[PDB]
Ligand SMILES: *[C@@H]1O[C@H](CO)[C@@H](O[C@@H]2O[C@H](CO)[C@@H](O)[C@H](O)[C@H]2NC(C)=O)[C@H](O)[C@H]1NC(C)=O
Ligand SMILES: *[C@@H]1O[C@H](CO)[C@@H](O[C@@H]2O[C@H](CO)[C@@H](O)[C@H](O)[C@H]2NC(C)=O)[C@H](O)[C@H]1NC(C)=O
């Protein structure tokens with residue numbers, strides 16, 4: 001059984017009129033796997049959210065299914081789903097009644113609604129969060145204690161030089177006694193391997209912000225995820241990289257015409273036909 | 282006996298030339314009720330201020346009265362009036378002698394001299410201090426412990442909602458479970474009375490700055506006190522309210538002509554004849 | 563024996579390419595008196611700097627002298643001169659080898675190289691440091707305990723008035739009871755001597771910044787030291803004062819023509835012929 005945005009109660013007894021409040025509490029995540037026998041309880045319809053008992057009574061007409069829609073549960077005293085800590089965006093009507101909600105943890109175009117604090121997202125690119133490649137490796141090197149890995153974000157320790165970055169073969173020749181180099185910004189640029197005296201280059205791991213490519217919410221809900229400055233080989237529809245990074249959820253049409261939505265650094269995006277395509281401008 | 286600005290001694294042994302220094306010490310307030318038998322002592326004339334003994338010897342020619350003028354008392358060793366903590370503005374001559382002083386606690390147009398730090402106030406409006414209506418009441422409401430007061434600044438406590446404001450009947454209908462409302466600025470806007478379930482509106486009490494309406498000190502000393510944003514029913518010659526607040530010390534002439542001194546928000550003030558009048562611009 | 567910039571070792575084992583690093587460590591000062599038998603050790607050539615043993619082997623061809631040039635000593639393990647704490651400016655080549663160094667504590671035009679962080683100083687005036695006349699005297703005066711000194715920077719204490727300045731005869735007459743005066747900036751301007759009741763004027767001692775007058779390093783190395791706002795009677799080639807202060811290392815040519823290098827406040831400086839001259843603009 002799929003919960004079509006069913007369990008949304010009033011977190012506090014505060015009156016709000018025509019606002020979009022952001023609440024951090026225990027709510028039922030939208031489109032969650034619900035058994036078909038805090039916790040959510042529904043019986044075909046008297047919905048109950050226990051945490052404090054919330055109740056709601058809605059007339060229904062269906063068989064062997066869960067009703068689709070939205071219903072706010074009211075505090076009573078001070079199908080089963082489980083509650084999780086989520087950040088919800090509640091829409092309060094002019095009478096204080098919650099008419100709609102957005103769970104900003106399920107899929108893209110939902111975090112964009114939280115970032116913009118609106119149920120209608122315009123046509124464009126929006127930077128929602130960032131992305132840092134976490135090092136899934138840890139190597140330590142000491143002279144004559146693990147193997148040397150390269151071309152991957154790894155926490156290294158070269159005879160006391162603790163750092164975080166990706167190692168690669170450098171074309172710089174150090175002096176016979178110098179053990180590590182430094183750039184203009186007073187940061188460790190290259191290190192000398194205590195074994196085999198190999199010179200390795202240190203590069204900071206991929207640091208970029210994620211962006212959602214949306215052709216407005218009035219046309220369709222199909223969005224594309226855009227990563228800035230990172231390669232998709234390190235990123236956890238169609239996967240393809242571009243000049244600005246990797247774009248998930250679009251196509252790689254070889255055509256080229258006028259730019260529609262500038263995603264940044266060359267390539268632009270557009271909506272065509274029921275499919276999002278990318279083209280070089 | 283009236284002290285015509287008599288007791289003003291040298292607070293410290295510091296030499297100053299052509300300055301207007303502000304001193305916070307124990308001085309005799311100007312135009313104070315002096316007995317006709319720290320303390321001020323005068324005998325018709327050898328004035329003494331004890332606190333440290335200050336002395337002054339001035340030739341006088343009068344009977345059954347106190348001499349009018351100004352005389353600075355000099356430190357001697359390390360009619361009777363009493364000293365109070367006052368903020369005085371002393372005028373030092375080119376030889377270090379105090380020639381005049383202003384007690385900025387007696388009447389309006391004297392605090393203006395301290396605010397401007399000058400013995401000559403120009404023609405215009407000057408904001409000297411502020412004014413906050415202190416709540417002369419404290420009510421506490423709990424469900425089934427004092428009476429409910431409205432239309433007056435009162436400290437309230439609605440089942441744990443401690444605040445300060447004026448309560449009035451609101452036209453907003455809360456939900457059957459919501460107990461208090463909140464505006465866009467994340468402040469308590471309305472509360473629900475735990476008794477009779479009446480909805481009350483919370484409004485911050487009158488916050489405004491006082492202003493002195495003076496037609497310059499070269500013409501006359503008659504000034505008018507202007508309160509901004511407050512009603513004279515809550516404010517502790519002629520009393521009348523205007524669009525910018527309450528104006529004390531003027532008239533309410535129904536005539537209208539060109540503006541002379543803009544007191545703010547419409548109405549202007551002018552000097553006519555030996556009387557200060559107000560007129561809508 | 564004179565050390566012609568001989569002892570300069572690698573402070574740390576860090577690789578740098580085409581940079582000018584500033585190091586604070588124990589180095590041999592340039593042009594220092596070296597015996598002709600941390601410490602510097604050279605033998606005609608295998609130079610050794612002990613601190614950690616640094617070594618260097620350079621072919622030489624000379625007799626009864628010390629070789630002139632520059633040679634960087636490399637770390638080996640973990641004529642005699644002594645090491646002192648100095649701030650050196652090291653020039654790293656594209657291979658990490660130190661090719662030249664500047665000791666910014668020997669003479670002027672060397673501190674300018676540190677201030678500009680370059681081995682080539684342009685033609686102009688550069689403010690390197692400041693200059694405050696330290697009081698070489700301390701007098702204390704109490705009423706009926708040292709002699710009264712004037713026209714010299716001295717720490718004074720007049721019956722509890724501790725301060726620092728130069729005392730001189732003031733033409734201001736205090737009141738018979740006032741002991742010290744104060745200016746507009748709320749600072750002690752004048753004091754009354756508890757003995758003989760003499761009025762003295764307090765003036766802050768000479769505060770100014772030093773400046774190096776250099777006609778560029780591409781033409782010659784002869785520079786002139788310029789002090790701003792101080793008189794040479796208090797300052798520790800040809801000494802002469804000007805409108806902007808005292809200028810050491812130049813001439814006082816009475817001629818006057820177009821300005822070449824504005825040293826500030828009137829007088830300008832120029833290079834003529836092998837001699838630095840100053841002239842009123
Ligand atoms: C530390 O030990 C390693 C392991 O023997 C040394 O690596 C070898 O060095 C020799 C001498 O140059 C080479 O012939 C081998 O091919 C190296 N081994 C590998 C797997 O390449 C290393 O040189 C030693 N380092 C020091 C400083 O002694
Ligand atoms: C708390 O007690 C008060 C006092 O009885 C209640 O106020 C009365 O409520 C009844 C029921 O509606 C009215 O008929 C009366 O007119 C009310 N009294 C007055 C003076 O107006 C109040 O309703 C009670 N509240 C709760 C929540 O029980």
Ligand SMILES: *[C@@H]1O[C@H](CO)[C@@H](O[C@@H]2O[C@H](CO)[C@@H](O)[C@H](O)[C@H]2NC(C)=O)[C@H](O)[C@H]1NC(C)=O
Pocket residue numbers: 705706756757758759
């Ligand atoms: C403190 O003592 C000194 C020393 O005697 C006094 O200085 C003398 O004062 C007399 C009286 O005016 C003069 O005739 C002398 O010429 C002063 N001495 C010198 C060396 O000039 C001083 O006046 C005394 N101060 C007080 C306040 O008593």
Ligand SMILES: *[C@@H]1O[C@H](CO)[C@@H](O)[C@H](O)[C@H]1NC(C)=O
Pocket residue numbers: 093094095
């Ligand atoms: C709020 O309540 C009033 C009460 O009559 C009703 O007329 C109005 O339609 C309600 N608002 C909404 C959005 O339902």
Ligand SMILES: *[C@@H]1O[C@H](CO)[C@@H](O)[C@H](O)[C@H]1NC(C)=O
Pocket residue numbers: 231232233
């Ligand atoms: C992105 O990084 C991966 C790392 O595996 C590399 O193989 C690829 O060539 C990189 N692409 C670009 C365009 O830098």
Ligand SMILES: *[C@@H]1O[C@H](CO)[C@@H](O)[C@H](O)[C@H]1NC(C)=O
Pocket residue numbers: 374375376
């Ligand atoms: C200050 O003293 C001098 C002394 O002769 C006198 O001439 C002058 O008038 C005095 N100043 C004032 C304002 O009285």
Ligand SMILES: *[C@@H]1O[C@H](CO)[C@@H](O)[C@H](O)[C@H]1NC(C)=O
Pocket residue numbers: 512513514
């Ligand atoms: C000012 O406040 C008093 C409160 O008693 C009220 O009666 C009056 O109507 C108010 N006047 C205006 C102009 O708001």
Ligand SMILES: *[C@@H]1O[C@H](CO)[C@@H](O)[C@H](O)[C@H]1NC(C)=O
Pocket residue numbers: 655656657
């Ligand atoms: C650095 O080393 C390379 C190695 O061949 C050499 O060609 C180059 O001249 C060196 N650089 C300097 C400044 O000597």
Ligand SMILES: *[C@@H]1O[C@H](CO)[C@@H](O)[C@H](O)[C@H]1NC(C)=O
Pocket residue numbers: 793794795
């Ligand atoms: C500079 O100070 C000395 C102090 O001994 C003084 O003699 C000289 O007249 C002063 N010169 C100028 C120009 O102020």
